[PDB]
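Exercise (ungraded).
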Amino acid sequence: ALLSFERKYRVRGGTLIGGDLFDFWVGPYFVGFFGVSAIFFIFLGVSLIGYAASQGPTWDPFAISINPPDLKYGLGAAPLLEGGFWQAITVCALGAFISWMLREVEISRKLGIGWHVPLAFCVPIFMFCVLQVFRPLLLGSWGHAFPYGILSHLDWVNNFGYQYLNWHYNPGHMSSVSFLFVNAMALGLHGGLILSVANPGDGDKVKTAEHENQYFRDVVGYSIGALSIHRLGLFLASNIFLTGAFGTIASGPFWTRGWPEWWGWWLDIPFWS
Amino acid sequence: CFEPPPATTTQTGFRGLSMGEVLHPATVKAKKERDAQYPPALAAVKAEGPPVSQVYKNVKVLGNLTEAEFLRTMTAITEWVSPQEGCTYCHDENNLASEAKYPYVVARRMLEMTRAINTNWTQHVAQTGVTCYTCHRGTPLPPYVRYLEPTLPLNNRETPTHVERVETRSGYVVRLAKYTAYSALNYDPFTMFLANDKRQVRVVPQTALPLVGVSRGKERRPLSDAYATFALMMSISDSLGTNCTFCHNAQTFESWGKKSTPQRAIAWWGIRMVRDLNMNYLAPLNASLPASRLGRQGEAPQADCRTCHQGVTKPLFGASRLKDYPELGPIK
Amino acid sequence: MYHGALAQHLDIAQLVWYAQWLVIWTVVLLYLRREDRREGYPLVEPEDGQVYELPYPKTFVLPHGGTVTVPRRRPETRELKLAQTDGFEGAPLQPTGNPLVDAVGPASYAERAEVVDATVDGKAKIVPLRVATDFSIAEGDVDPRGLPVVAADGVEAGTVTDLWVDRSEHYFRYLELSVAGSARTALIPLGFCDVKKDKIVVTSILSDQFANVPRLQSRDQITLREEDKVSAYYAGGLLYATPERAEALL
Amino acid sequence: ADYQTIYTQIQARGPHITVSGEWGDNDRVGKPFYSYWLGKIGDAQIGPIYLGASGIAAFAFGSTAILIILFNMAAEVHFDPLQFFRQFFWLGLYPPKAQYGMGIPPLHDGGWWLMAGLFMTLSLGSWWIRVYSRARALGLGTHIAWNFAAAIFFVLCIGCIHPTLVGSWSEGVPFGIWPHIDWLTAFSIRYGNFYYCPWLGFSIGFAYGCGLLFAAHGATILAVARFGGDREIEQITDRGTAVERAALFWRWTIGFNATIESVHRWGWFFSLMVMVSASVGILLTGTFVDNWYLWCVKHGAAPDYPAYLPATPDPASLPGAPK
Ligand code: BCB
Ligand code: BCB
Ligand SMILES: C/C=C1/c2cc3[nH]c4c(c3C)C(=O)[C@H](C(=O)OC)c4c3nc(cc4[nH]c(cc(n2)[C@@H]1C)c(C(C)=O)c4C)[C@@H](C)[C@@H]3CCC(=O)OC/C=C(/C)CCC[C@H](C)CCC[C@H](C)CCCC(C)C
Ligand SMILES: C/C=C1/c2cc3[nH]c4c(c3C)C(=O)[C@H](C(=O)OC)c4c3nc(cc4[nH]c(cc(n2)[C@@H]1C)c(C(C)=O)c4C)[C@@H](C)[C@@H]3CCC(=O)OC/C=C(\C)CCC[C@H](C)CCC[C@H](C)CCCC(C)C
Ligand SMILES: C/C=C1/c2cc3[nH]c4c(c3C)C(=O)[C@H](C(=O)OC)c4c3nc(cc4[nH]c(cc(n2)[C@@H]1C)c(C(C)=O)c4C)[C@@H](C)[C@@H]3CCC(=O)OC/C=C(\C)CCC[C@H](C)CCC[C@H](C)CCCC(C)C
Ligand SMILES: CC(C)=CCC/C(C)=C\CC/C(C)=C\CC/C(C)=C/CC/C(C)=C/CC/C(C)=C/CC/C(C)=C/CC/C(C)=C/CC/C(C)=C/CC1=C(C)C(=O)c2ccccc2C1=O
Ligand code: HEC
Ligand code: HEC
Ligand code: HEC
Ligand SMILES: CC(C)=CCC/C(C)=C/C=C/C(C)=C/C=C/C(C)=C/C=C\C=C(C)\C=C\C=C(/C)CC/C=C(/C)CCCC(C)C
Ligand SMILES: COC1=C(OC)C(=O)C(CC=C(C)C)=C(C)C1=O
Ligand SMILES: COC1=C(OC)C(=O)C(CC=C(C)C)=C(C)C1=O
Ligand SMILES: CCCCCCCCCCCC[N+](C)(C)[O-]
Ligand SMILES: CCCCCCCCCCCC[N+](C)(C)[O-]
Ligand SMILES: CCCCCCCCCCCC[N+](C)(C)[O-]
Ligand SMILES: [Fe+2]
């Protein structure tokens, strides 16, 4: 149950809250206060999902859907079967995401490593708050949030986009997609570069840091370097949501027209009209 | 750049589907003010004396009306169509029976068109109905018309830049974009779908798998048809100042039942109505109009959704004059 | 008839759906998850499971001679100055002496090879500027040589005497300093240095803790294991420089 | 804080390094220069670049494609440079609007598009050769070349393989900023909503997965930069505390972990799978599936919802309805 190098690292300490109370492992898993609160929010949320689903038309995993209230409930509570389950499940999701993040902090501290991972993980958490909390607050109803259903969430995304005629022209979305695309390509390049160095093939010798830099110097005339590509990777991945969030928040509260029309700022300048 | 909050939002679909209208209050307000310029109904007059078919010399459409009723109609017509030009726009001041002036015969046709709309297209216009004002808004030339090529500005009351002019070839893409809510879709959905009944708007297969015999090579509609339908839908949306979810659940554009709102059925009737108006009332008017009214291919200006709706989901927010002017339809 | 339709109301896309999950699961479970076990296995507590989870060994042919095979048996000889805090199996351990010197917890180093890391031409990769004379500091950046090193207790720990550059990547990795009052030199990774115009701030350890930084065997070169020993000592400070640091931050 | 993970506090300068290839050493041109500000967040050295036949051919074929597109775009604005600058995002080079099947379309309706596609393809293939052959020259495995082949393959899928499979060039992707975007919707409309295509799901899931993984991997390496985690090659051939800690971070968080080598296999695989999944989806579409939503309904997957406003019968199918 322990990696052969693991025991020396399995020391006491590093917590944010709780100290020795929850400072232990269950199998490979560190617990900690935030492990305990994670488990709690997860159990609660999954139980509410199962129960809510049981009251609905289907057990098919793809078609199950737990939906927020009608717009007219604004920011108040809704009957359980009319959005209330959705409200409670959202609160549990947040609790679980935030615990998971804070637990990652404790794990980092115990290992004497940077806190860069939980910090990165704040980005999708923040994105979730944009969709489910901040935009609905700005619009005045919980009902603008997305439903919990594997395919139904996509119907929401779909309708949300077409409410603005063509969502592809949303500058936040263009930015977001560009970062998604370049990030996916860069992860391929980074993974392939490293593998190509450690696995030349045919009994050949493993290459070097110098070969690494030579490769991209040759192919594109520049090489960012070994540490920097990791900083770059984090920056590109992060900016998928950090810029996408602006496009999401803008739609409704800061723009009610179709997105293509927004580009009128450029097209309609009197000079070239 | 942006529109400051709050946004007015409605719900047109089951909760959680992000379906409904998204409106900017200042814009809504401005449109209400423009549309509240609709002249009030004229005071009612009692039917009295003989029908104007006996009294006047050249009445072909409104013959059942009494003198006072008829002259009331003419007053409304003037308020609606040519309030700045007055009665003599259509009339020879010395011979009210004369058809010498082109607007006169055009207006008689328009009277038939208007009664046809209110009598035969109630599936669209319901008991709200239309008057000359609905399209004309107080000018002989309605502010929103289409030719057989895209024209800018959309509102012909605004002065065109040199690039907007239909003769400036470098301005074509922009003329096309602004008719399709600024998209780059390379199709004019007016000539394709609204001028006449030649083309089919639907493009989505009605089965999961491709039917052998309609799905290979030249048997297929080209993908251009799907861009074109998208163009039309962008244009319809902009014409009613709404978005796709006013009519559709985007889960499945092609489906009716729970997947479409009653507004979509009404829109479908509207396409049929527009094509009727265009093919049967408006296009044939090129024989009766001065050359200067015609498009570069000799066409008369025609109607689209914007012609009536002018950026609102019901024209003039649902204002009606139907019971005030029964002579405009429905005709028993 | 329909394109893609098969007997039994099956269709082609439907088959490709199963096929695609099968490729994904096969690659994830049978390939990747086994590649994940080229280090640290087998676990410690000959079961069938221990054989099934491992991939076939692979051999790396090293750029400067010799080979490395993984996975391989690597039991950890070194006695650990650690004790159970409780009988429970997932209970943490606690240091029985000085955890920094004893090298446990976040102060642990790995049993890396006692080998000097090399450039592509076989030279020592990580070397002080006194040796790497063709290397310099970019103009616009602080020259830290001569600056004091200030520890977490705000006391001067010593004086910067050199910088260790990575010749293969053109990147400084260590500062070398003279330790005040200890008649010895010490390396510190740049990652533990806050470089200012007038000083180097080190929050990882206290001033008196510089006395026990692991020592190199040679003055002008460093082994892979020494790099680990040196880095690990400061990382240990993050949790152990004061008794307070292991305890709940809030 | 490890300030090194944000930017380089003290930059080093030294003689530029040249790694000798099996061939092509004499095709490196340029004298490298250095940027001080770039050296904060990357290597300072820019250039030199490798030329070679493959790279030159790639520029030759690539420039031709670009000239064909720009020229047709400029025709679209009747060669007015001001309107060109203004309307640029809206301008495009289109595949045939009419249905000619697989017949070579006339130049004014798709012909030029096809030429552009051809030259783009040759450009991509030539560049592929450079990518592949630089790795052989430097004694490196072919990993990047396979990933790039998959990206190229996807481009051929949407460019010509899918058009060939349904037998219509009208289905190809237009060249242009907005026009290539409009295609996305047109395609989705034609094939019954791509959110109901499982291969969209797979491709997006792996794309988001690339997001998660690069964020996680990028942060993990930064979090262990203090132990030299960034020197990944020697961490592979000689495990250091950096990667022991990285592995344990993940093991204690999610219950399992990778190695420093295998995390790159995971990343490479996810990236590959974005393109593989997308390609498979495109090859299935029109060929074997006509409407994805209906296909999901057929297989019992599609969610359904109560009416909100009244349900709305198709008026076209009503008794008495006009056409
Ligand atoms: C017709 C409508 C469309 C649309 C509508 C749309 C909308 C409305 C929005 C996007 C947005 C976005 N779209 Mg777009 N889109 C995208 C790509 C993207 C993403 C880059 C981006 C952000 C996604 C997101 O917010 O995730 C969010 C994911 C979250 C919050 C997950 C967080 C993780 C969580 C913290 C942890 C969860 C843990 C699990 C519960 C635990 C599971 C336990 C197990 C695993 C152990 C592409 C590539 C395309 C293409 C190729 O066409 C496309 C087309 C379209 N989009 C259509 C045009 N899209 C968003 C955007 O940024 O717009 C500017 C957005 O709002
Ligand atoms: C603004 C736009 C958004 C969007 C748009 C979007 C699109 C367009 C697509 C997905 C798809 C997917 N989304 Mg959605 N999404 C999902 C979850 C998912 C998965 C069902 C699937 C694969 C995603 C993936 O592999 O990521 C990368 C993460 C990886 C690889 C790690 C493993 C993730 C694991 C598969 C997630 C499992 C989720 C569980 C089924 C649900 C929670 C389980 C709980 C009850 C225990 C979550 C948990 C959330 C949260 C918490 O916010 C979210 C938010 C959003 N999605 C936004 C609303 N998403 C794809 C799909 O197939 O839908 C059917 C798809 O095409
Ligand atoms: C999931 C995995 C993904 C993935 C994978 C991979 N993607 C790769 C590779 C891998 C593995 C490589 O190995 C290869 C490479 O090398 O990386 C450094 C490459 C590539 N990915 C490019 C673009 C890209 N990838 C995208 C997407 C994804 N990719 C997906 C997501 C996207 C998106 C989504 O938009 C884009 C735009 C290029 C940078 C490059 C193409 C080669 C080329 O470029 O061929 C064309 C070559 C040319 C030379 C034409 C250009 C010439 C013009 C005229 C330049 C003239 C300017 C000049 C300075 C002026 C002087 C004029 C003078 C001549 C008179
Ligand atoms: C831009 C940067 C990004 C980024 C980055 C990072 N991402 C991270 C991390 C970092 C750094 C971690 O460090 C952390 C981790 O450990 O990695 C192994 C993590 C994680 N990324 C997950 C999913 C994920 N990342 C996504 C996106 C991005 N990641 C973007 C790209 C997406 C999508 C769809 O985009 C998904 C689905 C989990 C695997 C994991 C959280 C575990 C958890 O929180 O456990 C605690 C909670 C649970 C185990 C379940 C809780 C169930 C609730 C109570 C009830 C369910 C409610 C739910 C709302 C219903 C949804 C229905 C659905 C159909 C709509
Ligand atoms: C309304 C219409 C929509 C629509 C349409 C479609 N969505 C598609 C497709 C279609 C048709 C596909 O065909 C493809 C696919 O999977 O089919 C099965 C695809 C995908 N959707 C993903 C994401 C997603 N979808 C969403 C939604 C919607 N999807 C809605 C439904 C959403 C959300 C949130 O809603 C998300 C997040 C991607 C992961 C995935 C791969 C794309 C990619 O990664 O492209 C990028 C890949 C490249 C650019 C290759 C480039 C590499 C070359 C080598 C570089 C050459 C450049 C060189 C410089 C050349 C020089 C220039 C030259 C002129 C000389
Ligand atoms: C009713 C009910 C459900 C409630 C009960 C709740 C329940 C499940 C708990 C039971 C109680 C238990 C068992 C104990 C409590 C203790 C506790 C806190 C346990 C938590 C249990 C729990 C919630 C587990 C879920 C874990 C989880 C979210 C896993 C998701 C894993 C996913 C899908 C990962 C996505 C990313 C991905 C594809 C990773 C694969 C590659 C990996 C491993 C990368 C990590 C990694 C990276 C990134 C490196 O850079 C690296 C560099 C050098 C060396 C190693 C690594 C390395 O390993
Ligand atoms: C929009 C053009 C138009 C305007 C403006 C207009 N009319 Fe008329 N007028 C007509 C048409 C058309 C007819 C014939 C109606 C028919 O055939 O039923 C007509 C018929 C008449 C007749 C019957 C003449 C006859 O003996 O045949 C009179 C009188 C008349 N209008 C008066 C007026 C007055 C008064 C005004 C100003 C308030 C006015 N008109 C403004 C179009 C117009
Ligand atoms: C469906 C919208 C619509 C309605 C309703 C409508 N019109 Fe018209 N009208 C048009 C269009 C389009 C034209 C052609 C453009 C033009 O010639 O100004 C036109 C042209 C005219 C003209 C000639 C204008 C000119 O000088 O060229 C007159 C006169 C006229 N209509 C009168 C009427 C009258 C009277 C009514 C009410 C009975 C009416 N219209 C109702 C759309 C409409
Ligand atoms: C005002 C109501 C209305 C709005 C708003 C609207 N549509 Fe439609 N749409 C219709 C009608 C009606 C039809 C059917 C036309 C016919 O059959 O003649 C249709 C047809 C379609 C079709 C073809 C369906 C098939 O069976 O092949 C698509 C795709 C579509 N619309 C997409 C959109 C998009 C995208 C938007 C927003 C950009 C939009 N619609 C907005 C009413 C509307
Ligand atoms: C039998 C026959 C004759 C042989 C078959 C011919 C053949 C192989 C045809 C193949 C055609 C193919 C693969 C077509 C695919 C086209 C695709 C995917 C186009 C997609 C997008 C195109 C875009 C966005 C082009 C935009 C063009 C411009 C902005 C102008 C060009 C200038 C640039 C700087 C382009 C760089 C784009 C970006 C990095 C900013
Ligand atoms: C492993 O290190 C890597 C580099 O430096 C050696 C790169 O330059 C690159 C290429 C990135 C740029 C911006 C040229 C990648 C992908 C990489 O992984
Ligand atoms: C002609 O080239 C163009 C630019 O370059 C100067 C732009 O910046 C812009 C504005 C867009 C961005 C993303 C800055 C447009 C629309 C454009 O067409
Ligand atoms: C697929 C397009 C074919 C165009 C040919 C491009 C020329 C490539 C020349 C190969 C380079 C020879 N070398 C040295 C790598 O072996
Ligand atoms: C983004 C698209 C994802 C849709 C995936 C739908 C797969 C349908 C085929 C499997 C059906 C299995 N079943 C009966 C449990 O639903
Ligand atoms: C839609 C993309 C799906 C890609 C598959 C996701 C891979 C994560 C699974 C990790 C497997 C965990 N484990 C320990 C059970 O092997
Ligand atoms: Fe890496």
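Further reading is listed at the end of the chapter. For now, observe: The interface with chain B takes residues 1-5, 11 of chain C (CB under 8 Å). The helical segments of chain C are 12-35, 48-52, 99-102, 224-240.
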